[PDB]
Amino acid sequence: SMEQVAMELRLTELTRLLRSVLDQLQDKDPARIFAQPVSLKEVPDYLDHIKHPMDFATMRKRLEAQGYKNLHEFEEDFDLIIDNCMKYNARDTVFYRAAVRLRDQGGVVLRQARREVDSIG
């Protein structure tokens, strides 16, 4: 149908905007701490601690498959990155501190993303 096509164009455009958001958030992680999944070879107990692991490569795979239907879904995944880190790692670690800085700096980007998503529809 024409309606399915219109819906698909909306999803393609949301995907375009989310890719720009993702790029902006990942620039706030210049140490690349969150770039890839935590390695289960190197952290063999990780899944005993963290039930839903997340990282920027895994988000990028979902995004490129147009797997985020709305901004809320994308934000859920970004919050997992931060929240998983702040639980597994202690306050005094470079990992926790990186997550705090990513959360704080990302908030600005996400604030305007929400306005754009609502604005453009």
UniProtKB/Swiss-Prot annotation:
Protein name: Bromodomain-containing protein 1
Source organism of the structure: Homo sapiens
Quaternary structure, from the entry: Component of some HBO1 complex composed of KAT7/HBO1, MEAF6, ING4 and BRD1/BRPF2. Component of the MOZ/MORF complex composed at least of ING5, KAT6A, KAT6B, MEAF6 and one of BRPF1, BRD1/BRPF2 and BRPF3. Interacts (via PHD-type zinc finger domain) with unmodified histone H3. Interacts (via PWWP domain) with dimethylated and trimethylated 'Lys-79' on histone H3.
Cross-link entry Glycyl lysine isopeptide (Lys-Gly) (interchain with G-Cter in SUMO2), positions: 41
Bromo domain boundaries: 9-113
Function according to Swiss-Prot or TrEMBL: Scaffold subunit of various histone acetyltransferase (HAT) complexes, such as the MOZ/MORF and HBO1 complexes, that acts as a regulator of hematopoiesis. Plays a key role in HBO1 complex by directing KAT7/HBO1 specificity towards histone H3 'Lys-14' acetylation (H3K14ac), thereby promoting erythroid differentiation.
Highest classification ranks of the organism: Eukaryota, Metazoa, Chordata, Craniata, Vertebrata
Localization terms from the record: Nucleus; Chromosome
Tissues showing expression: Highly expressed in testis.
